[PDB]
Amino acid sequence: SGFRKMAFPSGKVEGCMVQVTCGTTTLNGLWLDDVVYCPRHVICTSEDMLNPNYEDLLIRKSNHNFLVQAGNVQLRVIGHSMQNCVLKLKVDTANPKTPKYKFVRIQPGQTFSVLACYNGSPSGVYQCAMRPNFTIKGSFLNGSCGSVGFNIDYDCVSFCYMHHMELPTGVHAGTDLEGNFYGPFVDRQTAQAAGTDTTITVNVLAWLYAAVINGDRWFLNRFTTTLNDFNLVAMKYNYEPLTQDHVDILGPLSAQTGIAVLDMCASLKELLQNGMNGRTILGSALLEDEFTPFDVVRQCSGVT
Amino acid sequence: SGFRKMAFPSGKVEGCMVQVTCGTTTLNGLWLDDVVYCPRHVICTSEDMLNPNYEDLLIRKSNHNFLVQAGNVQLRVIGHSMQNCVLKLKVDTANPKTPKYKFVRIQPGQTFSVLACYNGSPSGVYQCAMRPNFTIKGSFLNGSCGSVGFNIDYDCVSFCYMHHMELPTGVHAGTDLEGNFYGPFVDRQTAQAAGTDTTITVNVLAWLYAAVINGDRWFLNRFTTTLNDFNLVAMKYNYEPLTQDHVDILGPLSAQTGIAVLDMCASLKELLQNGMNGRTILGSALLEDEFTPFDVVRQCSGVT
Numbered sequence A, B: 001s002g003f004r005k006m007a008f009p010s011g012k013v014e015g016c017m018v019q020v021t022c023g024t025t026t027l028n029g030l031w032l033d034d035v036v037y038c039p040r041h042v043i044c045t046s047e048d049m050l051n052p053n054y055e056d057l058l059i060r061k062s063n064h065n066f067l068v069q070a071g072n073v074q075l076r077v078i079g080h081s082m083q084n085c086v087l088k089l090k091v092d093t094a095n096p097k098t099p100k101y102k103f104v105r106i107q108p109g110q111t112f113s114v115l116a117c118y119n120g121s122p123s124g125v126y127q128c129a130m131r132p133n134f135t136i137k138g139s140f141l142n143g144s145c146g147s148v149g150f151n152i153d154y155d156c157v158s159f160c161y162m163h164h165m166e167l168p169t170g171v172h173a174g175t176d177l178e179g180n181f182y183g184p185f186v187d188r189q190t191a192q193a194a195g196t197d198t199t200i201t202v203n204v205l206a207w208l209y210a211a212v213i214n215g216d217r218w219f220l221n222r223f224t225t226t227l228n229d230f231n232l233v234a235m236k237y238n239y240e241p242l243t244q245d246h247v248d249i250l251g252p253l254s255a256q257t258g259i260a261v262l263d264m265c266a267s268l269k270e271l272l273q274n275g276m277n278g279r280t281i282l283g284s285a286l287l288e289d290e291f292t293p294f295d296v297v298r299q300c301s302g303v304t
């Protein structure tokens, strides 16, 4: 029992972190096999970031300008290329600590762990969700660029995020491991609109199921609702509309607790319309949307 | 910017986890140098747990009864001893992945990361506080016993907790790495009173400082208070009385923000007396007490 915002064990990812320096800029790189991946803005000075011409800035750089240090040791760079917003530095040595890995583009509303790093050194690990508007509300400071987000399925690390930027609003933006930004962002020091965000309804329902499993049940009521009725309330409260695909992924939690998904929707409806009345659910005084149904099952069954 | 409940990177601790089996019971062990530490209740059956005579139960066990497996490989047990509520199994091989480490007994109100494990395999990492009543509100299931809590100071892991038990209230109890329980608990299947808990005042103030640093400042007011006046409010709201030692550790945060500690106390006083009025601070709708002043400084400066 108990339910926490749990991150994946970060060890497999710590073994891949390196520091990449190009000129006066230092950030984090991810060393997998014989390639180091890092944000392409490592080639910019502060002056360049207002409107960088990355193709031109990269043409002035040679393999020997990219200083890659794996803690104690220096890596020899034998190739460089830009793919979207990431640089790929081919090194002459495959990382001996490379775990089994995949590069995946996650969907908005999915969660992942972030290993925040500075100068190629891991500082901390936290779990977060990719917001429906493709931003993440992380904890990142200058030098954290190149820190990665990931999930783990037994021995396989699926890398889904590389940190690039903090928006003027204090929220975070980055790319998949092929250098494609999540959302409409560009790697430039320009104010950029993040879309209207929404609350991840299916995650809130999964978390209400986690609450019932762990003994917090005051919010259960004698009511039920329909997808249509629930979606009118979801609309009013800026929640994602619930679909049958979301109901389907909540099936295991509905089966484990015996609480039909639409009955849990009626509890969520009442919580939206009435608030918490000064009470808490799993130590929170608000509706939590950073746990997916898979996260709740994994945490509630003890998956390693 | 941004502020998250960040755990330490767990890699150094993942390399120490092993599975320990004695008869029909399997739990986690911590392998450091040539010793494996685990909860002594690994020697009990379910029948034994109602009132175990650990000295007698351990006398029926030999070195060969303790099956220790470090993932793939079996460790050869050449000695066993009980120290308080932990067993120490001497193995013939020093763990090659042993990090620089210390065993420390943490104070109530201090925080640490937990690497939750099952069958010697890490499942997740989360940050938590040792409650003033010496319980922890973790996320643990059957098989998690032997999972450890720790802090890291550059390359040194200070192990402070080993999980033993879930109280009938769903909260967690365990020991330091010398097998001494935190709090009044005993390793027996008996209902046990955890003391009256309190909110960790110095941590809430540190978190209010983290909020101001990260832009959440609506709660700042035109008031100040005294330690005596603040402590009357702390008393009413079941918060730990604030002392000069707590004011002193908040000095760096007071200096960084220019907000005197007693002025932050007056904001906390108003929040206690009025609530949040439906607003949030750092994404929370309640007053958070799981960040120490050191945690806030570390997170807000980017320490690796």
Ligand SMILES: Cc1ccncc1NC(=O)Cc1cccc(Br)c1
Binding pocket: A041, A049, A140, A141, A142, A143, A144, A145, A164, A165, A166, A167, A186, A187, A188, A189, A190, B001
């Ligand atoms: C200072 C900071 C804090 C947190 N995360 C990231 C940062 N750094 C930046 O945002 C630098 C930067 C500026 C403009 C475009 C790009 Br791409 C990168």
Ligand SMILES: Cc1ccncc1NC(=O)Cc1cccc(Br)c1
Binding pocket: A001, B041, B049, B140, B141, B142, B143, B144, B145, B164, B165, B166, B167, B186, B187, B188, B189, B190
């Ligand atoms: C089932 C579970 C869940 C979470 N953490 C721990 C557990 N396991 C236990 O508490 C088993 C146990 C029973 C009585 C005394 C002692 Br010492 C240990």
